[PDB]
Design an enzyme around this catalytic site. Structure first.
Site, PDB file in Angstrom:
ATOM      1  N   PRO A 187       0.777  -1.248   0.000  1.00  0.00           N
ATOM      2  CA  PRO A 187       0.000   0.000   0.000  1.00  0.00           C
ATOM      3  C   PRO A 187       0.816   1.310   0.000  1.00  0.00           C
ATOM      4  O   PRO A 187       1.988   1.340   0.407  1.00  0.00           O
ATOM      5  CB  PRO A 187      -0.819  -0.101   1.298  1.00  0.00           C
ATOM      6  CG  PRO A 187      -0.474  -1.438   1.933  1.00  0.00           C
ATOM      7  CD  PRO A 187       0.806  -1.885   1.325  1.00  0.00           C
ATOM      8  N   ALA A 232      -1.350  -1.468  -8.652  1.00  0.00           N
ATOM      9  CA  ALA A 232      -1.530  -1.091  -7.242  1.00  0.00           C
ATOM     10  C   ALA A 232      -1.727   0.433  -7.187  1.00  0.00           C
ATOM     11  O   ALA A 232      -2.869   0.933  -7.220  1.00  0.00           O
ATOM     12  CB  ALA A 232      -0.349  -1.521  -6.391  1.00  0.00           C
ATOM     13  N   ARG A 233      -0.604   1.145  -7.036  1.00  0.00           N
ATOM     14  CA  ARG A 233      -0.577   2.611  -6.972  1.00  0.00           C
ATOM     15  C   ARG A 233       0.623   3.222  -7.705  1.00  0.00           C
ATOM     16  O   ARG A 233       1.763   2.829  -7.482  1.00  0.00           O
ATOM     17  CB  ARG A 233      -0.573   3.052  -5.531  1.00  0.00           C
ATOM     18  CG  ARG A 233      -1.946   2.935  -4.939  1.00  0.00           C
ATOM     19  CD  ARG A 233      -2.748   4.152  -5.229  1.00  0.00           C
ATOM     20  NE  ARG A 233      -3.249   4.646  -3.961  1.00  0.00           N
ATOM     21  CZ  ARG A 233      -3.297   5.926  -3.624  1.00  0.00           C
ATOM     22  NH1 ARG A 233      -2.877   6.859  -4.475  1.00  0.00           N
ATOM     23  NH2 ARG A 233      -3.766   6.266  -2.435  1.00  0.00           N
ATOM     24  N   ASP A 260      -1.532   0.132 -14.480  1.00  0.00           N
ATOM     25  CA  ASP A 260      -2.899   0.582 -14.426  1.00  0.00           C
ATOM     26  C   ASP A 260      -2.874   1.880 -13.718  1.00  0.00           C
ATOM     27  O   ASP A 260      -3.916   2.466 -13.453  1.00  0.00           O
ATOM     28  CB  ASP A 260      -3.795  -0.381 -13.668  1.00  0.00           C
ATOM     29  CG  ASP A 260      -5.261   0.014 -13.737  1.00  0.00           C
ATOM     30  OD1 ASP A 260      -5.703   0.436 -14.821  1.00  0.00           O
ATOM     31  OD2 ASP A 260      -5.957  -0.040 -12.691  1.00  0.00           O
ATOM     32  N   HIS A 265      -6.293   3.032 -14.806  1.00  0.00           N
ATOM     33  CA  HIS A 265      -6.751   2.705 -13.452  1.00  0.00           C
ATOM     34  C   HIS A 265      -8.083   2.019 -13.389  1.00  0.00           C
ATOM     35  O   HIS A 265      -8.956   2.404 -12.619  1.00  0.00           O
ATOM     36  CB  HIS A 265      -6.740   3.922 -12.541  1.00  0.00           C
ATOM     37  CG  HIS A 265      -6.111   3.644 -11.220  1.00  0.00           C
ATOM     38  ND1 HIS A 265      -5.073   4.393 -10.715  1.00  0.00           N
ATOM     39  CD2 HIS A 265      -6.384   2.702 -10.290  1.00  0.00           C
ATOM     40  CE1 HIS A 265      -4.713   3.908  -9.541  1.00  0.00           C
ATOM     41  NE2 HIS A 265      -5.496   2.884  -9.258  1.00  0.00           N
TER      42      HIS A 265
END
Lengths: 321, 331, 328, 328
Positions: C206, C233-234, C258, C295
């Site tokens: 995260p 993820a991010r 993404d 995303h």
């Protein structure tokens, strides 16, 4: 930092000493349950560890814990009076889902291949033939129903779905992450449609005798029931009638109501073992194990290790509370 | 178009009528053996079909067969030892078999025995029922299968199916086969015989039976296995030198064994009204062992198996009737 | 009882009207955000339900909320950081923590399989060079001979592991925390080793301050030249400059993304000028060994269904003085 | 025991050399087809190995081979049309199963890429500057989907194991019944496969009776939302029909490894515009189509098996064996 353990079995010992030396922490241990007569042992200790067989009722233990500098009581597995704790309590929420899952699957395949029934025919009647009624079937042709699915239930699902089986399941709580493995549906549908039925709900007053007469007439007469969860989930006597009168094909048990009478003990008389047990144990289309579902190295390792590394983070500042 | 069926047991019947509807073929049926007495029934049939209990002994049968114009004798089993082939060529007669009928049946029996043994189930029950002892001893702790390596000797339909299954469960599967099939690499890793024996927590046999394979598992081979390991034979008894397996279990060379088939089985499996004289000490010695499970060559015994032995046979013969030659033809 | 919903998308509607006719509940909706103006529809409600793109920064909204006898604000997303929590002392807050682990696990997997097969690289040689040959440097491999490495393993990391493991790949992983329920699908090991051994590296830790820019130069040079980096993820886990540099020099073989640091300018936006769209997007996006998606790892019927239904069921539970665990 | 090899490509070289080295045979090699100039190389050899692009149709070569005393022609593919059997009168062996999972994996990859709309999104991002999530580009988890196979062999079955593991329902039509296969799929009829599947995969062999097996009628039968995958053989699909169906919305997209009529340009370079066909260009411009140049086969494992299965077959030949790879 010093730690004091209680309730330890010889099998827990190796993994204890492996953690002791790995995390470089001093550990003192003993097979006996924690009493006022054994609180003296938690001297210096940052924590005490228990794996209780019984309630730790008497409250002066706690007095001595916080007087000795114990930060935390960490279980390896409700036996703790929580009112007296205002010390931090910890548990071991997850030791090996796959352990109980694997036992479940095992007992279900044994019965399915009707091995118990064959060995009886072979050994008591001397009958080495293949009867119409003992034909078996492949697992992928079957649909499995789960009453209650948590960490243990879901592991069971991943395994059977992997073997090609349809799994259908009833739980009061939707976890989306399980959808790859099972179809959620209602209690009754689970009982109606399933060729194997596996119990995985928790034990609560409301859930005691969850499974009795109704359920069994309700199961497929060709179905097998599997309880690797809690004996109080099953009305045992009900089970025994169901089986006799053939309302199910078989049952696999890792647990029975009132098992604490004889499970865990040795050298019992015919008289100290109950007749309901003796009766099931004798049925070729049943298998019983002494609540051993949990019993793998991984379970033992994680019962000790999870709690001690936790205990290390509490001698400094985890979710177990 | 007509087919005569022999040796039908009740249990086949619904698959038989079922197939006869699906294909529009006329079937005459009988629960009796094919002999001189019953060859009559083959009249105006393109094929007969069997699930034999003994040799087909009479030349007359084959002569009267090609004289009716029966193209083929289809067996509903892998085994064709029961057919005289000198005479099937003499009478310009085809023969077919059913080589593959339900691999997962056996693979699943295999797994079942493995798992049962692995969980020490028979050993706990023993401590329970006879030493009146319900504790968990140190030596009966188990492990999860995703921590184990399973070793196959022989990877055929059955072997590969074991591989796909135990692999689905996360175990490492290693195997020895004389033959390389790229098909199987997603599920196992090929190695040599010695290694399979040496590294495996479970050894499962799946090679066919030849002279060169009789007693393939012997003293030397049980010495090479782990103390902890289990021997599974849901293949053929003759692969195992039984005395040797007994010695190994007694001497704690391995931990346990799961057997669907025994050497010298043929004289007791599938018999009734046996008296202790007619059942061997071989079997008796193994059967009192809590770390042994034995089934009576029932690994195959599922509805899929029975069905497929009917239907694979019958469509093979239907294609013979149509003028095709199916790979089930025995040469 | 009554619940009002904001930030509602056309796609959400059916699922909502379904929960509605199913639970005997009134739901009034609007496509626009919660604010001074639109707070007026939360009248009579036991709850509001949001899927916000901005902070709800106006105090008035919260006060009129506790003024209407509104019990809780239920987010339909994971991120509750668009709420000021000082003022929520008036108001409960629920979120939707898990909606489809598998949605993201399957996007992750798809992007990996795509690069591993070199389809974008092939279509580049087919479409720009008129070349349909099969070169040395384009050979591929079967998934089961490769080892897949996870940095961070949660609900998503494990779903991914489950899939790859099931296809016969070896999975290694780094997570700060041990989860026994994942051993059937992966082997834990250290961060460095995940990067050194893997053929596919996928990220599922995260976003934290101590995590911002997890993947930079050091790590990409350490990955196998032939390895593929997945970020579903991010974006802020990955230093785009370093990524661009590595892909350009052949320090890794490809990437599926993404998500991207800085993505908020253009992800979610239409009718964009070439100025409005940054150069790092256009640079990665011009590369045949890259795949990028906007995303939408999350974006399935299961996610929409569950983002609506979990949150509403929680709201009902709180309309009956329940407290489902998604209290925040 | 010495071997001649023809048609070798740079990538094969290593497995060749490693195998001659591992088994103590000498091998000679050459990049051109086997014809009457290069036949002179196979002198002293016990067998040859080619990987043909067109027919060996010179008779000198056959009888010059039996004069040099060669025993078999080993092919490193399935395709034997190129050998003339009139002239073999010489044994011929092929390599029938080299890596089913390579094709099954392209099948699955293309299927997931399609299923996740990465192509449609790429179009809206790069040409419309639109980075939003539309209703029609909602996607779905694979376990909620059902996969239909027309044709089920080594490859179709491998596709089945993979999609089954992911939790999809798999169904297939085949003229033959394979017990080995019931764990992964459920047999049924052709119509039904077309009618009920959310993904259709072609895996039947090519036969005169199978040419244009998927055409206009069959495409009306599939679902608006279903994808067609052909990692099998191009002549299996009516490209005209397929193009027009894609155009009409009869199906939702397609993933193709092969095209009716491909052998003009697949494996060529550098074509002119006139030399790459109208149909190809039409499809390739469709964001819901994916086209790879018959690379489905193209893996480490495949190359290797093509070489090593053939050479070892040839070695069992020189020592007098007659392996099942013998096609007569």
């Amino acid at each position: 930092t010093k730690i004091a353990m209680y309730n330890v079995s010889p099998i827990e010992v190796p993994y204890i000493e492996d953690w002791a030396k790995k995390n470089d922490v001093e550990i003192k241990t003993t097979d006996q349950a924690l009493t006022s007569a054994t609180v003296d042992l938690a001297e210096g200790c940052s924590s005490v560890s228990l794996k209780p067989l019984g309630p730790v009722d008497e409250e002066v233990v706690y007095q001595k814990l916080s007087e000795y500098g114990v930060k935390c009581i960490g279980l390896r597995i409700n036996t703790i009076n929580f009112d007296w704790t205002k010390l931090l309590v910890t548990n071991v929420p997850v030791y090996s889902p796959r352990a109980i899952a694997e036992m479940t699957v095992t007992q279900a395949m044994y019965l399915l291949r009707k091995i118990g029934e064959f060995r009886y025919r072979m050994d008591h009647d001397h009958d080495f033939t293949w009867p119409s009624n003992l034909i078996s079937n492949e697992i992928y042709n079957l649909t499995v129903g789960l009453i209650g699915v948590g960490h243990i239930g879901s592991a069971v699902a991943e395994i059977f779905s992997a073997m090609g089986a349809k799994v259908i399941a009833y739980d009061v709580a939707y976890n989306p992450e399980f959808e790859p493995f099972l179809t959620y549906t209602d209690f009754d549908t689970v009982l109606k449609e399933a060729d194997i039925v596996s119990l995985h709900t928790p034990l609560f007053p409301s859930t005691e005798n969850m499974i009795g007469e109704k359920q069994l007439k309700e199961m497929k007469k060709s179905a097998y029931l599997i309880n690797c969860a809690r004996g109080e989930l099953v009305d045992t006597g009900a089970l025994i009638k169901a089986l006799q009168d053939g309302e199910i094909a078989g049952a696999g048990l890792d647990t029975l109501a009132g098992e604490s009478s004889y499970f865990g003990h040795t050298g019992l008389t015919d008289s100290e073992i109950p007749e309901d047990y003796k009766t099931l144990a004798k049925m070729p289309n049943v298998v019983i194990t002494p609540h051993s579902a949990f019993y793998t190295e991984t379970s033992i390792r994680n019962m000790v290790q999870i709690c001690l590394t936790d205990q290390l983070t509490i001698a400094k500042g985890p979710r177990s509370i």
